[PDB]
Short mmCIF file of C-alpha atoms and ligand atoms in Angstrom, two decimals:
data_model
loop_
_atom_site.label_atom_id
_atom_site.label_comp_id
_atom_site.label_asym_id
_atom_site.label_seq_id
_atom_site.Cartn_x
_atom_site.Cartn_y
_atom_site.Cartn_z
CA UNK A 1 -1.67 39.84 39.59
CA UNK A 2 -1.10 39.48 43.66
CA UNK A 3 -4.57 41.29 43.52
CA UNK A 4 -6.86 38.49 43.93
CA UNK A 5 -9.63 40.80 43.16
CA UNK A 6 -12.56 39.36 40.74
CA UNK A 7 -16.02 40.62 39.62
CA UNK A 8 -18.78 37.82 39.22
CA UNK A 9 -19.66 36.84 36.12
CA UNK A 10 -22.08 38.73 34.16
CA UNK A 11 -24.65 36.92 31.96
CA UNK A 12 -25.04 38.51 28.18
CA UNK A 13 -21.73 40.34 28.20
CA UNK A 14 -19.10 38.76 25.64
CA UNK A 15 -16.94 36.06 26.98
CA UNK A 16 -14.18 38.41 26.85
CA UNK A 17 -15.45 40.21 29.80
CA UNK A 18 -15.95 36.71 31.73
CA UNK A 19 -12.83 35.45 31.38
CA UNK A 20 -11.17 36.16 34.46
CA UNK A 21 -14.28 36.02 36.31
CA UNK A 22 -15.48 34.21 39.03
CA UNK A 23 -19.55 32.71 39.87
CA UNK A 24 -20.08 30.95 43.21
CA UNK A 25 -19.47 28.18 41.73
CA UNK A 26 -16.27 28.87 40.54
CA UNK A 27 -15.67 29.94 44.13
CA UNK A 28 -17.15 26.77 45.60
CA UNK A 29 -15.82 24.49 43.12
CA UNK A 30 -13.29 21.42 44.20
CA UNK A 31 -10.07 22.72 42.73
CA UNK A 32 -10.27 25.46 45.24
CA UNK A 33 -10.31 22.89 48.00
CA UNK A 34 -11.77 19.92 49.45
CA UNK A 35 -15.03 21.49 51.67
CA UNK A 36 -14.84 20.32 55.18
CA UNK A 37 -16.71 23.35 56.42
CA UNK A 38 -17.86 26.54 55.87
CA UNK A 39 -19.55 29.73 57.08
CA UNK A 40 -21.90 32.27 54.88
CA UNK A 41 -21.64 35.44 56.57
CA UNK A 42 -24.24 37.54 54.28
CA UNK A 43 -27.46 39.99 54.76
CA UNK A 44 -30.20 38.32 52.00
CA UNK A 45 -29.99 34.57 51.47
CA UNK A 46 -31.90 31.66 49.14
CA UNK A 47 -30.86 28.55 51.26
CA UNK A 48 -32.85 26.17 48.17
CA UNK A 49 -30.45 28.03 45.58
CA UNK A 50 -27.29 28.65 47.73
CA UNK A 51 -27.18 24.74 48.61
CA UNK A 52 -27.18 24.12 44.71
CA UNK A 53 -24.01 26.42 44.07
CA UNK A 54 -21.78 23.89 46.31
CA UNK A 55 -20.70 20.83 44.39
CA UNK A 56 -23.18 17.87 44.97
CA UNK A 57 -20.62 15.81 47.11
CA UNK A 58 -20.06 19.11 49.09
CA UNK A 59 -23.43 19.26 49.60
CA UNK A 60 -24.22 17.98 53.25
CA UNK A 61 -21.05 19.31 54.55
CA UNK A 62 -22.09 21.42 57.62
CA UNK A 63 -22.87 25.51 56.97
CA UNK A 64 -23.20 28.28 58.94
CA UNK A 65 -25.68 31.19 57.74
CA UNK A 66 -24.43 34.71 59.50
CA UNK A 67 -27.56 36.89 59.16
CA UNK A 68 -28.87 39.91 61.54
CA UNK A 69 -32.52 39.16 61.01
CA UNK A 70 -34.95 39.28 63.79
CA UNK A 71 -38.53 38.31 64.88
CA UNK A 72 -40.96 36.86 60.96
CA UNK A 73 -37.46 37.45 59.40
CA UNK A 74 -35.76 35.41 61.71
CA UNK A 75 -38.18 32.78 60.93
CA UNK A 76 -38.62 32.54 57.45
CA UNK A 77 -35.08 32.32 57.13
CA UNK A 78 -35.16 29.34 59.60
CA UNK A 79 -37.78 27.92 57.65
CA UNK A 80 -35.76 27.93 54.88
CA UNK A 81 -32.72 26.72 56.29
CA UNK A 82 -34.71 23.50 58.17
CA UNK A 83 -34.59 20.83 55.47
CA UNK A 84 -30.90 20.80 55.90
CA UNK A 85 -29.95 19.42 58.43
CA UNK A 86 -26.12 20.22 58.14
CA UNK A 87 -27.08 23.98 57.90
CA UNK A 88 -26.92 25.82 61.66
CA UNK A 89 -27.60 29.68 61.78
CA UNK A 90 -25.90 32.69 64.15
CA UNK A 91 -28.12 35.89 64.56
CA UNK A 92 -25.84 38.80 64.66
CA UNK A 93 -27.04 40.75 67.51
CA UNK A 94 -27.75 44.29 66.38
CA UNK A 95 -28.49 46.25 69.94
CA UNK A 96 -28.75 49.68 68.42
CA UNK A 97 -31.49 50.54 66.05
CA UNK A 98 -31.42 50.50 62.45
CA UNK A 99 -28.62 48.35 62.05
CA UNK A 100 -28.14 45.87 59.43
CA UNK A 101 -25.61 42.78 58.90
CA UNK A 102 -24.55 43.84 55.79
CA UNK A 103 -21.43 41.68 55.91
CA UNK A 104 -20.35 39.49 52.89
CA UNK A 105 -18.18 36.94 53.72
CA UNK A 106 -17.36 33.05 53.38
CA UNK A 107 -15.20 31.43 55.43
CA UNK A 108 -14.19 28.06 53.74
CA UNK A 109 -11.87 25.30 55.63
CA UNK A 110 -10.51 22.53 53.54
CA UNK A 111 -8.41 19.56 54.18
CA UNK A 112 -6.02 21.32 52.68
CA UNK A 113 -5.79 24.61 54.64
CA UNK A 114 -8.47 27.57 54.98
CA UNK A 115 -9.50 30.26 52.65
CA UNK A 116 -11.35 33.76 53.12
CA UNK A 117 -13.39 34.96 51.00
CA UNK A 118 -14.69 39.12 51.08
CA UNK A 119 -17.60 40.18 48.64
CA UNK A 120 -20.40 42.20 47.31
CA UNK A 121 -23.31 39.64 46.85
CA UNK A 122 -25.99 38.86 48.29
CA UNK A 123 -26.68 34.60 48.53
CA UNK A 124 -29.68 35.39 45.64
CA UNK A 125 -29.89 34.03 42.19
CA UNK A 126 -29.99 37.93 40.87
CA UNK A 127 -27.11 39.20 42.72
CA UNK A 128 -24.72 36.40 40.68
CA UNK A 129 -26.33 37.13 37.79
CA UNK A 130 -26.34 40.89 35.85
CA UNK A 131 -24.44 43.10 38.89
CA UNK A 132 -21.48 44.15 38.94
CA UNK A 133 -19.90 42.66 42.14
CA UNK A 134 -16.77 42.41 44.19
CA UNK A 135 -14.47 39.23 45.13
CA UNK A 136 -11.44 39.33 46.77
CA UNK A 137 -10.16 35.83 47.70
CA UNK A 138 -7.43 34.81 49.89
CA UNK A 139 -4.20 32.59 49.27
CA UNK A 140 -4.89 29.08 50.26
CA UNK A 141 -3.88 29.26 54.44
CA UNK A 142 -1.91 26.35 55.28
CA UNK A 143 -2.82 24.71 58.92
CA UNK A 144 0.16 25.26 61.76
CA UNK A 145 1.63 21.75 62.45
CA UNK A 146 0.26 20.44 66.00
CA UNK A 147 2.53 21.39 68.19
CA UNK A 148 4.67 24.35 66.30
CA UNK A 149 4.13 27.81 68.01
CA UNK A 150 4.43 30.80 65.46
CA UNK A 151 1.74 33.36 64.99
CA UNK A 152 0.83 33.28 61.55
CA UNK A 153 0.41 36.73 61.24
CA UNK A 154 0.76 38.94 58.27
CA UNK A 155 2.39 42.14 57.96
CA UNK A 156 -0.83 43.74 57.70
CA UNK A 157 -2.27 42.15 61.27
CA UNK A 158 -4.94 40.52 59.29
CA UNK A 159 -4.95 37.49 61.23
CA UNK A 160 -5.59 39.33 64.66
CA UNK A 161 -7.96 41.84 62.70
CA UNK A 162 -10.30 39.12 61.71
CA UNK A 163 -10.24 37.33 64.87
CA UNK A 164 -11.15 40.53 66.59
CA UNK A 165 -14.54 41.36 63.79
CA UNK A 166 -15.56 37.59 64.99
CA UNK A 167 -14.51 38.36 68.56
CA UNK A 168 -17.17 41.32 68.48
CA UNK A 169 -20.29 39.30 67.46
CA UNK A 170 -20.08 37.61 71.00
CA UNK A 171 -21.55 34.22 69.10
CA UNK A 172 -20.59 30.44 69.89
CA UNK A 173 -20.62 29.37 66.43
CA UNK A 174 -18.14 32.01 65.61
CA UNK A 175 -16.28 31.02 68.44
CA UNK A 176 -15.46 27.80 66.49
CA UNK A 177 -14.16 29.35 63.58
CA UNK A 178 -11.81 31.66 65.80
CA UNK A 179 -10.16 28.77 66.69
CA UNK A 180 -10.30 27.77 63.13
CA UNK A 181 -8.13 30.65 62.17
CA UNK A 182 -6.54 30.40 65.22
CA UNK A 183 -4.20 27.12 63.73
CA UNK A 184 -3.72 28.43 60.30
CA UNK A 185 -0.86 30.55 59.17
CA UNK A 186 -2.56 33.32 57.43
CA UNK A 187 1.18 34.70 57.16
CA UNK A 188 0.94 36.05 52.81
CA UNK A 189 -2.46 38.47 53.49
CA UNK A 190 -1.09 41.66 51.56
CA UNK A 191 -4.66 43.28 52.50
CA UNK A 192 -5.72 45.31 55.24
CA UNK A 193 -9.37 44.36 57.12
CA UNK A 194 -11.42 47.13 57.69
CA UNK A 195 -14.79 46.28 59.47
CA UNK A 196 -18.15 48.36 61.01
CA UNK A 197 -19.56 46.82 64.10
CA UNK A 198 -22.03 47.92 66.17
CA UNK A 199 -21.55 50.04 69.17
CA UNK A 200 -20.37 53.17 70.78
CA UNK A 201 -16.52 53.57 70.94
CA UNK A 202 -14.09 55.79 72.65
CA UNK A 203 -10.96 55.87 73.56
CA UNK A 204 -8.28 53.07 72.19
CA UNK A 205 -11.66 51.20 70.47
CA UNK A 206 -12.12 54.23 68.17
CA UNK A 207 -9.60 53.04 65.64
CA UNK A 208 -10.68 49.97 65.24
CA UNK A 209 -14.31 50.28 63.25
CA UNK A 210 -15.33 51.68 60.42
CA UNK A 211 -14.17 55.51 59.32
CA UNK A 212 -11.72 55.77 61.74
CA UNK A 213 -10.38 52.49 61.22
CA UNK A 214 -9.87 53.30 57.59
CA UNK A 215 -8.11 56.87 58.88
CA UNK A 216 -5.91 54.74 61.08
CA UNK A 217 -4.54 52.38 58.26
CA UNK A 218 -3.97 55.59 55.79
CA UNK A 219 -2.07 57.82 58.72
CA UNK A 220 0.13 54.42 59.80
CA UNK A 221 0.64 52.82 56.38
CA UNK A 222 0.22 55.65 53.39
CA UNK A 223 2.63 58.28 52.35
CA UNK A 224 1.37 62.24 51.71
CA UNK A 225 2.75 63.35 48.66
CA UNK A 226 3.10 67.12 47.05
CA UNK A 227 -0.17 68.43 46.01
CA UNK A 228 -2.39 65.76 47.54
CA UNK A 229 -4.72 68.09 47.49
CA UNK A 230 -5.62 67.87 44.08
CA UNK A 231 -5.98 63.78 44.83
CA UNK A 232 -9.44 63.03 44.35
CA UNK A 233 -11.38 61.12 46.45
CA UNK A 234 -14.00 58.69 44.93
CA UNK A 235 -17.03 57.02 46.32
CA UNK A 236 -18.48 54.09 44.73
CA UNK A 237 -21.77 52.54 46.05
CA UNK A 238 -25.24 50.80 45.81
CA UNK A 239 -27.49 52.78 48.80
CA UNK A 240 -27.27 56.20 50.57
CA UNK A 241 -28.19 57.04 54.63
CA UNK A 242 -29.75 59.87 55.09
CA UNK A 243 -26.33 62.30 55.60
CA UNK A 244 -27.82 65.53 57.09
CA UNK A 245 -28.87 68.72 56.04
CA UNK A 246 -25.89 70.10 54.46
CA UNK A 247 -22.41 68.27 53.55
CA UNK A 248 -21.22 69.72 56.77
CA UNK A 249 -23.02 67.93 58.81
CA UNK A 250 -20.88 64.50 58.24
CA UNK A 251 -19.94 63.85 54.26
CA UNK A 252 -17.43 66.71 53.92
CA UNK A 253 -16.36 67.36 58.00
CA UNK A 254 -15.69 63.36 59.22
CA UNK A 255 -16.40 61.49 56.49
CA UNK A 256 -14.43 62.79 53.80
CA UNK A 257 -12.03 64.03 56.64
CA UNK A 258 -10.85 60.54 57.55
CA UNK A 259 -10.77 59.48 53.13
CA UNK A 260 -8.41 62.02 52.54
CA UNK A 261 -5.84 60.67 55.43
CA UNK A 262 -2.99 60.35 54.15
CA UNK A 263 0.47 59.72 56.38
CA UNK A 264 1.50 61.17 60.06
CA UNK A 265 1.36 65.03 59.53
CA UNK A 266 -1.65 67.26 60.15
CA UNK A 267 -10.91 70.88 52.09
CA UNK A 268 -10.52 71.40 48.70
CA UNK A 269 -9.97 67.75 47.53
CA UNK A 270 -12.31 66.89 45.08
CA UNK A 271 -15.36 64.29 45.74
CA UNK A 272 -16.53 62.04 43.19
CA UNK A 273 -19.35 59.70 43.78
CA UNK A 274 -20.77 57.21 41.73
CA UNK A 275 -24.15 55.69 41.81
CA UNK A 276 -26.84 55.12 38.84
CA UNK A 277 -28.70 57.26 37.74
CA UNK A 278 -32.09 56.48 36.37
CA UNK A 279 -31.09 56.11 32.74
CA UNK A 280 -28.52 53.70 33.79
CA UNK A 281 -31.26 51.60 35.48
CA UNK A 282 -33.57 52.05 32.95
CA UNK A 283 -31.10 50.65 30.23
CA UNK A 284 -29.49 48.06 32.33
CA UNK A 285 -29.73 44.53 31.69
CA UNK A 286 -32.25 44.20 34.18
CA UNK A 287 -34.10 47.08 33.52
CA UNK A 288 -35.78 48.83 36.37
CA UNK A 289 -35.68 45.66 38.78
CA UNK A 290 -32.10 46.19 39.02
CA UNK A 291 -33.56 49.18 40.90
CA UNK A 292 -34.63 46.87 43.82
CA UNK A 293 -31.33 46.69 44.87
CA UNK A 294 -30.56 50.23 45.19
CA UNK A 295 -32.52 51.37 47.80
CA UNK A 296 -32.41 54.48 47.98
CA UNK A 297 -35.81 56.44 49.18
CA UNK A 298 -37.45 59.05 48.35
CA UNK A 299 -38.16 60.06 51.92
CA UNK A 300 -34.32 60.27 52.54
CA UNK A 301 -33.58 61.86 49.07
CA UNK A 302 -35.67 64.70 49.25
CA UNK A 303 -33.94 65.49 52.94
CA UNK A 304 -30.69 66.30 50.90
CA UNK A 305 -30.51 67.11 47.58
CA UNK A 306 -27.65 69.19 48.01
CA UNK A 307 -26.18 65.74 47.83
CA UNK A 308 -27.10 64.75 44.06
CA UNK A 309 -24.48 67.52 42.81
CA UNK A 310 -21.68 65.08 43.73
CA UNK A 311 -22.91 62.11 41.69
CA UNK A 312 -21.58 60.64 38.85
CA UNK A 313 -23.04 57.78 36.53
CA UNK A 314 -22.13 54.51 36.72
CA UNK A 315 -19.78 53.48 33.70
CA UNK A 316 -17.59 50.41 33.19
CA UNK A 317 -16.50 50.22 29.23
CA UNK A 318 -12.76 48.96 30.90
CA UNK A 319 -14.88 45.79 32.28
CA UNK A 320 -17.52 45.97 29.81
CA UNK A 321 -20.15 46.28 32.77
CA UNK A 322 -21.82 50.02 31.98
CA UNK A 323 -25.16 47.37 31.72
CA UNK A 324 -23.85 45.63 34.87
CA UNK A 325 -25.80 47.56 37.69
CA UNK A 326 -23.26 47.97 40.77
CA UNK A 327 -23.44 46.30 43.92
CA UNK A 328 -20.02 46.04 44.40
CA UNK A 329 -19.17 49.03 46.97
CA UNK A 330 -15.44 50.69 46.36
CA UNK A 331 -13.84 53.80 47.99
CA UNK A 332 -10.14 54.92 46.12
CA UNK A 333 -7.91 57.77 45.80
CA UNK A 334 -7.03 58.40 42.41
CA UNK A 335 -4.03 61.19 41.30
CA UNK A 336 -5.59 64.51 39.65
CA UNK A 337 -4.96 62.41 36.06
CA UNK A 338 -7.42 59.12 37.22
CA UNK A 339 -3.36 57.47 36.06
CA UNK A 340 -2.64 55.90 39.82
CA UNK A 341 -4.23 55.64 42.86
CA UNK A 342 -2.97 55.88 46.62
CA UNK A 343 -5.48 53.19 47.52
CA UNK A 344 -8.45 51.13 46.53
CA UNK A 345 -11.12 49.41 49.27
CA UNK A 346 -13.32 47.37 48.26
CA UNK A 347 -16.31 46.54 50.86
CA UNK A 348 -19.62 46.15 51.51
CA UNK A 349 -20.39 49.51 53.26
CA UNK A 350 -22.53 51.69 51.54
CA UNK A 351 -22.57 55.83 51.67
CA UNK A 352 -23.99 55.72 55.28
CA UNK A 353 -23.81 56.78 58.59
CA UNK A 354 -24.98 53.20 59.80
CA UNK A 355 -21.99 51.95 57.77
CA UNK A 356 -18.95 54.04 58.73
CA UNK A 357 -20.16 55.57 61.90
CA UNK A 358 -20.74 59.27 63.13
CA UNK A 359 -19.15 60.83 65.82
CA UNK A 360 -20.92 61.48 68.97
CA UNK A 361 -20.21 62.86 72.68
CA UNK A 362 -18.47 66.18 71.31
CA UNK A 363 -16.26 64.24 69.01
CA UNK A 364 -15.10 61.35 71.94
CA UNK A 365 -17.29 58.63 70.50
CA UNK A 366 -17.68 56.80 67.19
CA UNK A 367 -21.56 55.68 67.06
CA UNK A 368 -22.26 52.26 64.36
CA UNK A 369 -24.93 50.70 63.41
CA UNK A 370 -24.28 47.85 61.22
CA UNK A 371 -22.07 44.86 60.66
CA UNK A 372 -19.76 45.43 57.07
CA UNK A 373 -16.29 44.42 55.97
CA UNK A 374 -13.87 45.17 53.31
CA UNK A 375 -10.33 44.99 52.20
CA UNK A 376 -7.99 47.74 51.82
CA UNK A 377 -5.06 47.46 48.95
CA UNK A 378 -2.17 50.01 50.07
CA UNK A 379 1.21 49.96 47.80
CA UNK A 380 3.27 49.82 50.90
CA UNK A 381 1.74 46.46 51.46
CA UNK A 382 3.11 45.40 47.81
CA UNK A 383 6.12 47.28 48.06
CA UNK A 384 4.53 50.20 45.60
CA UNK A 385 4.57 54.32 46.49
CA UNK A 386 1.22 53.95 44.46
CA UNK A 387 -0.51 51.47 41.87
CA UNK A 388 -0.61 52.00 37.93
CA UNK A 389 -4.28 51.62 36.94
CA UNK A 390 -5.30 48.85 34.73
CA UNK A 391 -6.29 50.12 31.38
CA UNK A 392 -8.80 47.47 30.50
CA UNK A 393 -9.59 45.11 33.48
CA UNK A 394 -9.86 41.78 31.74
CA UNK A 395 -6.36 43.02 29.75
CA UNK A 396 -2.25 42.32 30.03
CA UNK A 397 3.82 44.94 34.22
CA UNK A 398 0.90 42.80 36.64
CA UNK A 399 1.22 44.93 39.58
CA UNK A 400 -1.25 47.40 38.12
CA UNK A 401 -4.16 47.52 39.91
CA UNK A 402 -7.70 46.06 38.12
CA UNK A 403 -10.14 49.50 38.49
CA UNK A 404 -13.61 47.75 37.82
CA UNK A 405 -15.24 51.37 36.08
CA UNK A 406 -13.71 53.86 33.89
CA UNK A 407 -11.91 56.95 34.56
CA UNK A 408 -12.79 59.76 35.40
CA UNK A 409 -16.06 59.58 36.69
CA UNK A 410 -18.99 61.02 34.49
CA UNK A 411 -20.91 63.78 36.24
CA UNK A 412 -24.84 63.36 35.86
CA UNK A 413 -26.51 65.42 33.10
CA UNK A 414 -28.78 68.25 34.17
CA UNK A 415 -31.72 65.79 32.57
CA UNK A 416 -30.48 62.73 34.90
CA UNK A 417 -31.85 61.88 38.41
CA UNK A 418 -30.11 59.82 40.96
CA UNK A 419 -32.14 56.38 41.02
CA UNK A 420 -34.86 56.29 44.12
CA UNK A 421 -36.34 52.98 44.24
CA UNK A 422 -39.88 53.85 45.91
CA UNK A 423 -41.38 55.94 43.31
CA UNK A 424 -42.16 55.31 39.51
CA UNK A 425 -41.05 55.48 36.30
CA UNK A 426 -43.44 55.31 33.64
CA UNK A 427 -41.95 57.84 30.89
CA UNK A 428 -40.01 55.64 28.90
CA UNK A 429 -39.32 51.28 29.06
CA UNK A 430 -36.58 49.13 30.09
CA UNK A 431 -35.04 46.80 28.39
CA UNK A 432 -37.39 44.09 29.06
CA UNK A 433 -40.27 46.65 27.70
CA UNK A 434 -41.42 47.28 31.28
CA UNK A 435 -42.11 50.54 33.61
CA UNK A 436 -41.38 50.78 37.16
CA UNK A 437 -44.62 51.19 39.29
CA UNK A 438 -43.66 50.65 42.91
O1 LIG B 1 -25.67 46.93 49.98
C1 LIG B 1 -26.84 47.33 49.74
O2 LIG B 1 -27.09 47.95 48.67
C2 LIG B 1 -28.00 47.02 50.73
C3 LIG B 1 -28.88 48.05 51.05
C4 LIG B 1 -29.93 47.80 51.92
C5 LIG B 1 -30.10 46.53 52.45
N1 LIG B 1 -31.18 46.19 53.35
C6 LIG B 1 -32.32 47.07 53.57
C7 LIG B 1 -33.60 47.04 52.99
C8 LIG B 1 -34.15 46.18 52.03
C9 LIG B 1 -35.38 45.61 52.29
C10 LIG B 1 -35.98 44.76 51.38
C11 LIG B 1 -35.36 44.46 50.18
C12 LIG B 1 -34.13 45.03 49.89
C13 LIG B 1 -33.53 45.88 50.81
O3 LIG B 1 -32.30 46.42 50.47
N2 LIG B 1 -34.26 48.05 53.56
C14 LIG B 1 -33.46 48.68 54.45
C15 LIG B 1 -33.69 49.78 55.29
N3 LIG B 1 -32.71 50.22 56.08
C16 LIG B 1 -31.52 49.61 56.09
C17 LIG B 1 -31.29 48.52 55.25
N4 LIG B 1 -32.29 48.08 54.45
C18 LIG B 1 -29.22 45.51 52.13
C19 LIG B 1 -28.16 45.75 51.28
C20 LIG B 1 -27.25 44.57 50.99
O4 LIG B 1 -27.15 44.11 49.83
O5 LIG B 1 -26.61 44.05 51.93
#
């Protein structure tokens, strides 16, 4: 595979469906690279438990914690952090309200070279452990000899793309690591960055954030084909904003405007989007507790239920992971057969307005939120008009692309309900023999 896309390992599936897997401390691990540095960009964090996944004589090697907490937040997570004394911490400002850091990122420099790292997980013991989660890890970037003036750019302006995300959080400490990247040749990057950061932008910044960035990449660098209409679109994800009082109002007129972009040239594409429903809590291998991280409330639910007609469950036979309760967030556009797909993103942004933005100013202004990042896999970036699906994802022509759930999507029985995490379920036990009482 030139992929480089992994789930985390799941505990209690068979080791079949761990082989190609990867924990964090597979990630962290010495034959990846000898640790000089490194920086946990990341919203929830367990310093005590993170510090453990490094390997012991990594241990004291300085780390910097990227969060966007504020005020008894800000705080505890200081509090936590203090016994180490190589770990230093950058609050991501986050000016407009309701925003969140949801960012999941490492950036790891070696003595041999630099690596990025994109995810889904949180820095928790439970987010490594039962989820299904996202990886996508970069080649090993070789340093620029002192001296040698090339740009070390990639085809897909990754280079310049990350620099600019760090550019935006206005932050010293990430200051340092954009002169990090600065004298590496991140020259092989076959992915595309797309990132959210907060703010109000018109004008040539429009492109660059969230939805619109994603439009951008799709008009520049995808190909419409004959009857894209009948290309789905899917949405995969672990939380849902509150999206209005009608799909008008941003799912179907921006939001699904900008996924089904596709080349130069100027809806009745179908939606699909997957998130668990109860049942598929209820029977996971957490049980109901996998239900604290997808928050999803009841006070926004009830606001929009027109919206629970476009969900499907959450099913993963090809990866063995239907147990596996998603965090990993993926948007794709799959042919009308589910055979190939036009593109696959994998990121941390959620089915939010906070996440991707929403137009403001009669259309002249894209309004964010939050802080998120993902990677976008387009064939032209592989050479490929589209990419084969993998049949199973842990199975054996390598430039077919590793789906992590099955095909098609499953569309909720009348009996199921999407999962809302602040209200309880007492009808029937989990796994562990437990109700949900919040
Ligand atoms: O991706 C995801 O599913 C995700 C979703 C939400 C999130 N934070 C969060 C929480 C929250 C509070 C306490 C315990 C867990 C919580 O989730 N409450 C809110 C309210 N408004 C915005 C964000 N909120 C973080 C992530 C993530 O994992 O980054």
């Amino acid at each position: 595979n030139p992929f480089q896309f992994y789930l985390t390992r799941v505990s209690g599936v068979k080791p079949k469906y761990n082989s190609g897997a990867l924990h964090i401390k597979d990630i962290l691990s010495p034959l990846f690279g000898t640790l000089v540095s490194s920086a946990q960009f990341n919203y929830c964090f367990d310093v005590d438990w993170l510090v453990k996944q490094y390997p012991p004589e990594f241990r004291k090697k300085p780390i910097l914690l990227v969060h966007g907490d504020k005020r008894e937040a800000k705080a505890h997570l200081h509090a936590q952090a203090k016994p180490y004394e190589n770990i230093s911490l950058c609050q991501a400002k986050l000016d407009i309200a309701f925003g969140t850091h949801h960012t999941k990122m490492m950036l790891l420099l070696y003595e041999e070279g630099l690596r990025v790292v994109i995810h889904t997980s949180n820095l928790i013991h439970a987010d490594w452990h039962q989820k299904t989660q996202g990886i996508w890890l970069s080649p090993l970037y070789p340093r620029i000899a002192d001296g040698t003036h090339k740009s070390g750019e990639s085809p897909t302006h990754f280079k310049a793309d990350l620099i600019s995300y760090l550019m935006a959080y206005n932050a010293p400490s990430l200051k340092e690591w954009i002169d990090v990247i600065h004298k590496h040749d991140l020259s092989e990057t076959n992915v595309y960055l797309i990132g959210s950061t907060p703010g109000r932008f018109q004008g040539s910044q429009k492109d660059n954030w969230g939805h619109f960035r994603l439009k951008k990449l799709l008009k520049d660098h995808a190909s419409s084909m004959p009857n894209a209409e009948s290309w789905p679109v899917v949405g995969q994800f672990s939380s849902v904003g509150s999206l209005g009082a009608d799909e008008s109002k941003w799912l179907c007129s921006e939001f699904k405007e900008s996924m089904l972009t596709l080349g130069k040239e100027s809806s009745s594409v179908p939606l699909y989007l997957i998130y668990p429903s109860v049942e598929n809590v209820r029977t996971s291998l957490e049980g109901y507790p996998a239900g604290g991280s997808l928050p999803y409330s009841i006070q926004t639910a009830e606001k929009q239920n027109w919206l629970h007609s476009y969900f499907h469950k959450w099913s993963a036979e090809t990866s063995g992971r239907s147990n596996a309760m998603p965090h990993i967030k993926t948007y794709m556009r799959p042919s009308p057969d589910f055979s190939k797909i036009a593109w696959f993103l994998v990121t941390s942004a959620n089915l939010s307005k906070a996440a991707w933005g929403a137009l403001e100013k009669n259309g002249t202004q894209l309004m964010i939120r939050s802080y998120e990042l993902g990677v976008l896999f387009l064939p032209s970036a592989f050479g490929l008009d589209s990419f084969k699906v993998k049949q199973k994802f842990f199975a054996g022509p390598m430039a077919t692309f590793p789906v992590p759930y099955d095909l098609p999507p499953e569309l909720y029985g009348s009996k199921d309900r999407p999962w809302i995490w602040n209200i309880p379920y007492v009808k029937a036990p989990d796994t562990h023999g437990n109700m949900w009482v919040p």
